[PDB]
Structure formats: structure tokens, C-alpha cells
Design a protein around this ligand. Sequence first.
Ligand SMILES: Cc1cc2nc3c(=O)[nH]c(=O)nc-3n(C[C@H](O)[C@H](O)[C@H](O)COP(=O)(O)OP(=O)(O)OC[C@H]3O[C@@H](n4cnc5c(N)ncnc54)[C@H](O)[C@@H]3O)c2cc1C
Ligand SMILES: CCCCCCCCCCCCCCCCCC(=O)O
Ligand SMILES: CCCCCCCCCCCCCCCCCC(=O)O
Length: 573
Amino acid sequence: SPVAGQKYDYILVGGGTAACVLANRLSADGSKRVLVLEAGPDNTSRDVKIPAAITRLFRSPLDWNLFSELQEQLAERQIYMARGRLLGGSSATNATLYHRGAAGDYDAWGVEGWSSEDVLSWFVQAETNADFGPGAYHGSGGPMRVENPRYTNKQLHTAFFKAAEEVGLTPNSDFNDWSHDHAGYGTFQVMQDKGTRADMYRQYLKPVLGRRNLQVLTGAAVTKVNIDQAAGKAQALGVEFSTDGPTGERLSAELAPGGEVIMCAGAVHTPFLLKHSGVGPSAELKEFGIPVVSNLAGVGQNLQDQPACLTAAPVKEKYDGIAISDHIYNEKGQIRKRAIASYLLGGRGGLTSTGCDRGAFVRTAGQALPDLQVRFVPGMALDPDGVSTYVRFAKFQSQGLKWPSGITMQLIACRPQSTGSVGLKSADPFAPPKLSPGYLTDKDGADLATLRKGIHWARDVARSSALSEYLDGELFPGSGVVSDDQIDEYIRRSIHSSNAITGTCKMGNAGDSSSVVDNQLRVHGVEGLRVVDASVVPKIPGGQTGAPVVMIAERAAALLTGKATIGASAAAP
Ligand SMILES: Cc1cc2nc3c(=O)[nH]c(=O)nc-3n(C[C@H](O)[C@H](O)[C@H](O)COP(=O)(O)OP(=O)(O)OC[C@H]3O[C@@H](n4cnc5c(N)ncnc54)[C@H](O)[C@@H]3O)c2cc1C
Ligand SMILES: CCCCCCCCCCCCCCCCCC(=O)O
Ligand SMILES: CCCCCCCCCCCCCCCCCC(=O)O
């Protein structure tokens, strides 16, 4: 209906992080008609603009409210896996931490034309940094905004840093500078613009909505990619979607000649939609009577996510009032006047904080790269599940209760060895995917050992003089949890997502049989079909995954507009 009689040069499935970048770059020269189909609504929520309101986005209407299959290995629990559902996607609902990982993470992909030396200029191009000028590792005029956090907990941030120094960890002045080792303690930069969320809707899509060659539909749930097995090769024709949920008429947006469909539905929904389109393991598609168009083993495999557990400790009675929970709420759960004023006057104070923007990368045992990320929070978890405690914190407002003053250290396996999957539980394209995070399933128990040693590291830091000055015992995991076996069980019962999720449409070299796309991001076995989102990441980098997604989208846009090629190698004689 809004696409009737229209031909598009690019159809983007999803309007999330990658999609906002592509919509911007691909519509730039005015020659090409670009359609964006987002299932969620427009990006207008105040809860998206205010970083501390991440607490309100979990388990909300702007989230997919996805739960995993029962995990036998995690005390037989379903795991919540937060995913943004609106223009800007998960960039609109995330913790805003700005990480690229290490040069070694990209070289470890071993994909031609995607080495650390290939990707660096694409990170730098995207970047405007308020605290790092132009140099080998920072750009200055890109659409992203990155800055040092504009909240500082004067006692607790300083005490964390001195405690990490007291246990002998080195500082890292810039976690995105590849001229030095990834490990160390310091401050995570944030995708914020003077303390307001700088999501990829705000930075890439919203500024160009005036473009007549760009059409963005919200409330538009893609149901499958339309693919024709005519001439003698599967050819994308366009995309089926409903603007009215499961009962809506199935509409078809149509490609112009030379048109491509680009999957931008993210590492959960892209492989889900490809399988509904006949692209996936033939046995899984047959299960639900989906005709096999491209028998591709890798689709929905290689799901990598960074699992988390935490410690938490209260402060002494005399340090009551010093935590971020005290900066945001008073003792009745009323939002502090000082926090509102600081946010509106100059974009500072507790409302600019996602809480978890100071920390460390640590090697638990002589690894080539750090296996542990620590996120320090100058406030106290009231649940061993940190995402649950954030939902609790949002619900706490106006309850007339006082949130106890304390700290948390979240431990993340940032370069995990476990993999999971995403597939189908039904033929209905509106049903939730069959989602398996696969936490703690690696053959050697490496991810569990990372988190157990993480808890020992957090206890060493909390015991050090600088922090123990403020603290008064331990709430989580608590004095009941001391042996290696007790810690493992605490981890199984409390492990939660740190919200990465990559690798379900793995990019790979020619000859790599686990790959779903080539190094041009083309889906194997289909013409005019690409994936440009977190799905394509072969091997997850350490740290949060948003900045690598924007880098991949920037480079794909350059490839599709003819501004760049990918690979590299001189022809053999
Ligand atoms: C709570 C949370 C915290 C995070 N913390 C951080 C952090 O601090 N820093 C960081 O860098 N990274 C963080 N991440 C990860 C980062 O946000 C993601 O890796 C990145 O945003 C993913 O980009 P994407 O384009 O691949 O997918 P998304 O941004 O998820 O975009 C996918 C889009 O597709 C849409 N979609 C799905 N199905 C359909 C359909 N059938 N039809 C139409 N549209 C559909 C979705 O609604 C969504 O808008 C976090 C993630 C979350 C969820
Ligand atoms: C954890 C609780 C998070 C609280 C966040 C909501 C705080 C509400 C403050 C009152 C609204 C402030 C004025 C509106 C600011 C609108 C967002 C913006 O335009 O940047
Ligand atoms: C925004 C400030 C809220 C304060 C809440 C109290 C402190 C709790 C720390 C929670 C445990 C670790 C952080 C969990 C981070 C969840 C966000 C994310 O993963 O994207």
C-alpha cells in the first residue's frame, strides 16, 4: 500500500543500528531509492534520550522481550535477552559503551580484506570524539558522537581505580588505541552527545529523513525475503511485510533492476528471517514446510554472546548517600532535583550515566587477549542478575523506599569460547525465535573458569585498602559462596546477558564452509541479498559490539556505492 507501484534500489530489513547508517550512506547521492522497514515504532521516547532511563527500556514495549529456551546447564532457566525494537534498534536501548576491542580480534577473523589494518580507517571515519583529537586511532568529523562520561562518582570511581592499582593492574588510557595492550583499568567512553543518548537513529537516519529518495516505514514487520528460482540462480525480488501485525495483509515491496535486499534485523532476527525465506539448514526449513532456496548450514549457528555475573557490596553507614542510586533518587524514590537540573542545564550528573562505564579488561590466566571485562558501577545491585536489578531500579521510582548505598562489579566473559544458536519453534514468522545463548557450554569449561576467576578478581579489588575504606561486607554472592563449586553454582543461577549477540550469519573466506556471507557480505546461493549487521561478525571482539556494527555498516555502504573495494590481494601470475 505505501509501496504500491514503487521500485527500490535498496530494501533494508530492519531499521536498527546498521540500517540507520546504510539508509544515510545509500540515499546520499540522490540517485538510488532506499526503503527501510522497521517492526518497532519511531524513536521519540524520552526513556531513549536519557542514558539512565536504560533502566526503563528493559522488559518494556521498546524491547523484543525475548527469552531463551530452557538452559539445562544454567539451573534449568530461561535467559532474558534484551533487544531494541524501534528506529535505531539496539543502539537506542544499549549501555552506550564505545569499544572496538583489540587489533588481534579482527586479525583472528582471518577473513581476506577484514584485517585490523583493513577496518581501522572505517572506525575512524565514523567517529567524532569529544576527548580524543584526530590521531592514528581517532577521527574527528564522523556522524557518531563519542565522549568521556559526564557523570563522575567522586569517591567511588577514584576508589575503584586506586583498588585496581593496589592489586597490580595497569591503567589503559584508551581501550580503542591499538598501539598498546587491551588489558587494564580505566573509563569507558560513551556514545552520548553532552550526556544525551547518541544512537544511530539520532546520528545517521534522523538528519536525512527529508531525502525524497528515502522511505522509512515503522510498524512494518518483515515476514520473509521474496526470492525467485527462475533463470538458473536464486534472485531476491524484494520483501514481504505486514503493517498491521499477524492479521495484516501481506504486502510486497519490489526491487528495481540491479536492486538488493540488505538484512539489518540483527544477530537474532536476521538468521530467523533468512530461514523463513528458505535460506538455512535444509532440515530446519523442512521441519516447518519452508521450501529450501539456499541450503546453508551456518545460518543461526555461531551465536556468540558475552555472559555476565556480579558481586555487590554495601558502603559503611558513614558513606550512606554517596552512590549513583542516591544521586538519581532520594530516600522516597523521588528523582533528585539536582540530577534533573544538571541534566537539563549542562548535560551532566547521574541521569547521563548508564552506570557501567568504568572498568577493566583482565587476563584471568595468560591468554593472548583479556578473557574478562569488569564493569564497575558506583551503586549496589539488589539482585545477582544485573539486568533484573536495572528493571527493579526503574520500578523503584515513587515507591517511598530507600535504595541501599553500595557498589557492584559485573564480570563478563568478553572473548567467550561457548556458542549458541537461533532457529524456528514454528512456521509463524511473527512468533519469537528459538533462541539458545549456549552460555558455559564450551568443552573445556573456559567461560565458567573466566567468570569464577572474575569473582575472585572482584573480591581482591573490594578487599584492597582503597575500596575497603568505603565498604562494609558483601551482599552478592555473599559469605555463603566461597568454594569453587559454590561460586560455579552461583554463576549458573545468576548468569545474565551483557547484550552482545553476534555471528549468526558468519562472514567467511572462500573455502570456509561455516560461512553464510562472503567478504562482500553477500548471502551464499542468492543474488541481490546481503547481510549488514552484527550477524556477520565471524569472531566476537572483546568489549561491547555496537561500534564494530557501525564500522561494518560504514564499510558495506562504501562497497555498495563504489567508493571502496574489499580485498586487496594482487592476482597470481
Ligand atoms: C540492552 C543492550 C545493551 C547494550 N550495550 C551496549 C553498549 O554499551 N555498547 C555497545 O556498543 N553495544 C551495546 N549493545 C550491543 C549493540 O547495541 C548491538 O550489537 C548493535 O546495536 C546491534 O546492531 P544491529 O544493527 O546488528 O541490530 P539492532 O540494532 O538490534 O537492529 C535490528 C533491528 O531489526 C528490527 N527487526 C527485527 N525483526 C524485524 C522484522 N521482522 N521486521 C522488521 N524489522 C525487524 C528490530 O526491531 C531492530 O530495530 C547492547 C545491546 C543491548 C540490547
Ligand atoms: C532510572 C530512572 C531514570 C529516570 C529518567 C527520567 C528522568 C526524568 C527527568 C524529568 C524529565 C527531564 C526533562 C526531560 C528531558 C527529556 C529528554 C531530552 O530531551 O534529553
Ligand atoms: C543507571 C544506574 C542504575 C543503578 C542500579 C544499581 C547498580 C546495579 C549494577 C547492576 C549490575 C551490573 C550492571 C548491569 C548492566 C545492565 C546494562 C547492560 O548490560 O546493558
